[PDB]
Design a protein around this ligand. Structure first.
Ligand SMILES: CC(C)OCc1ccc(C(=O)O)cc1
Lengths: 300, 237
């Protein structure tokens, strides 16, 4: 178990840690989150009570170091910092009184949700999408645009997702215009899987990360990327069987976790009706189709 | 963006633009089989690609052999149109390539954009103008060359004949769409209007009769009357 201590909580805030969230009042005696599994990946996110604009947060992996949160009264946000002096950190986190003012990561044992949602997500790939090499953790917020969006305005503060554009030369072989636009298998298998991602696990990792940034931060470009990566698979007549089966499970848990009141803003009616009811893979998403129909029949 | 009538004059600025109409690419007759079924038979068609400023019409004849052994022909026809328009653009010297291609049917947008990826600076757009280019096959010389073709063929016409010697491109395009709307609305009566007088002939190198300026005013009036008469008949006005 690891601990993400907080120096203080000077401003009232809603704090998320992975799929959980709780509130902290202004200047409440709150010193952090205790009992976190080392895991492979985590996210801590914030939405200020007095200004719900800018949700923001940090992706991190406890294995890569000791992370703590300190509020910065100049920039006005809770900042993640790393302590390299592990003994000093162990001394602060040992502290029995400090632990009394910390909330415990509250994982039900039957609950494997967090890991179903992040199975393919790895910190080293996050750090390639979110470029800030001097930190081991990665900052994302509601307003950050994607590199692709920027091409249609600060490349430092951007989300470097893999560009997917169905009406581009990368997606369309000269001489195969109709073929490749109607059946995106070339673009999926040769360009993306063999060329860029190298395997389906890395593809799914970016798809999972995009989903989670859209859900936790309301990041619009992330939502666009999640939907595009889904549509690329579904619009391909030729897809490995293992990948289709795994896609059904990935999407099932994403749809299951989605806030029910957030379906108008996080689900694109067009894409999902194409994928479930019209595409080459309509029949390969049995569990996803079943949860969507019973949970969100209005969208369909 | 989508074109219309606030910017109707813009069609005649100096940016080269082409209209593309695909409504006569895939054409069929519908007839009953021996077993009693009904069967289609394709007949030759054409892509109608027009420069509205100059009158230059690039008529690509679509021979029925291109459909042989193909499925989903309505869908294929859009991609075939897009293939041929892209080929036309590539065949043109750079200074003659359009800055905009305006498709009369929105279903042409994605096929054409995908075939024109090599030309990112060429805008591909629909229009809110309802244009009567589907009546192009009512122009006898165009219909003749399409129906006589035994192989794919491209034929160049000036759909304004020599009118630009005397009127503006704006006026010529208005005359053309009036004529074509009348042909679409009541083809046999529109042809009677145009051909009723044997002393006004069609030059060997023209599509329309050699009307004088005053005769064109009269013809245009008779075409407007034809269109209004048919409106009244249709809606019992
Ligand atoms: C519980 C206590 C207030 O945590 C604050 C905090 C701040 C810094 C560090 C460090 O740098 O070692 C560790 C913990």
């Amino acid at each position: 178990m690891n601990t993400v201590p907080f120096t203080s909580a000077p401003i009232e805030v809603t704090i998320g840690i992975d799929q959980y969230s709780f509130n902290v009042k202004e200047n409440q005696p709150f010193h952090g989150i205790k009992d976190i599994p080392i895991g492979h990946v985590h996210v801590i996110h914030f939405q200020h009570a007095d200004n719900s604009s800018m949700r923001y947060g940090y992706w991190f992996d406890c294995r890569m170091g000791n992370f703590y949160i300190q509020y910065d009264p100049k920039d006005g946000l809770y900042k993640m910092m790393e302590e390299r002096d592990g003994a000093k950190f162990e001394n602060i986190v040992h502290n029995f009184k400090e632990r009394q003012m910390m909330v415990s990561y509250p994982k039900i044992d039957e609950d494997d949700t967090w890991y179903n949602l992040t199975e393919f997500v790895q910190m080293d790939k996050i750090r390639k999408i979110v470029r800030k090499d001097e930190n081991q953790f990665s900052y994302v917020d509601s307003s950050m645009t994607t590199v692709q969006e920027n091409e249609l305005s600060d490349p430092a503060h951007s989300l470097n997702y893999t560009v997917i554009n169905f009406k581009s030369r990368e997606a369309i072989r000269p001489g195969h215009e109709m073929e490749d636009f109607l059946d995106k298998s070339y673009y999926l298998n040769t360009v993306m899987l063999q060329g860029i991602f190298k395997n389906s696990s890395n593809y799914f990792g970016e798809l999972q990360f995009a989903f989670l940034n859209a859900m936790f931060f309301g990041n619009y470009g992330s939502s666009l990327q999640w939907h595009a990566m889904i549509e690329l698979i579904c619009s391909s007549a030729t897809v490995p069987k293992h990948m289709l089966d795994k896609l059904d499970e990935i999407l099932y848990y994403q749809i299951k976790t989605l806030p029910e009141q957030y379906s108008d803003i996080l689900l694109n009616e067009r894409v999902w009706n194409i994928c479930l009811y019209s595409s080459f893979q309509k029949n390969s998403l049995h569990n996803t189709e079943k949860i969507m129909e019973n949970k969100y029949p209005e969208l369909l | 963006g989508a074109m219309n009538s606030s910017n109707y004059a813009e069609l005649f600025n100096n940016d080269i633009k082409l209209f593309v109409d695909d409504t006569n690419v895939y054409r069929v007759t519908v007839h009953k089989t021996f077993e009693g079924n009904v069967a289609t038979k394709a007949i030759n068609g054409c892509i109608f690609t027009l420069n509205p400023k100059t009158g230059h019409l690039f008529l690509k004849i679509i021979h029925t052999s291109v459909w042989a052994g193909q499925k989903r022909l309505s869908q294929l026809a859009k991609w075939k149109t897009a293939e041929e328009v892209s080929a036309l653009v590539r065949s043109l010297p750079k200074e003659e390539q359009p800055k905009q291609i305006i498709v009369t049917r929105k279903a042409m947008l994605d096929p054409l954009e995908v075939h024109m990826l090599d030309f990112p600076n060429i805008a591909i757009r629909p229009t809110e103008l309802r244009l009567p280019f589907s009546a192009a096959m009512s122009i006898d010389k165009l219909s003749d060359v399409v129906m006589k073709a035994t192989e794919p063929q491209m034929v160049l016409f000036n759909i304004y004949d020599d009118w630009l010697d005397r009127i503006s491109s704006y006026t010529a395009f208005s005359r053309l769409t009036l004529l074509l709307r009348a042909l679409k609305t009541n083809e046999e009566s529109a042809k009677m209007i145009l051909l009723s007088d044997p002393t006004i002939t069609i030059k060997s190198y023209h599509l329309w009769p050699s009307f004088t300026d005053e005769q064109w005013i009269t013809i245009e009036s008779q075409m407007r009357d034809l269109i209004l008469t048919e409106y009244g008949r249709k809606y019992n006005v």
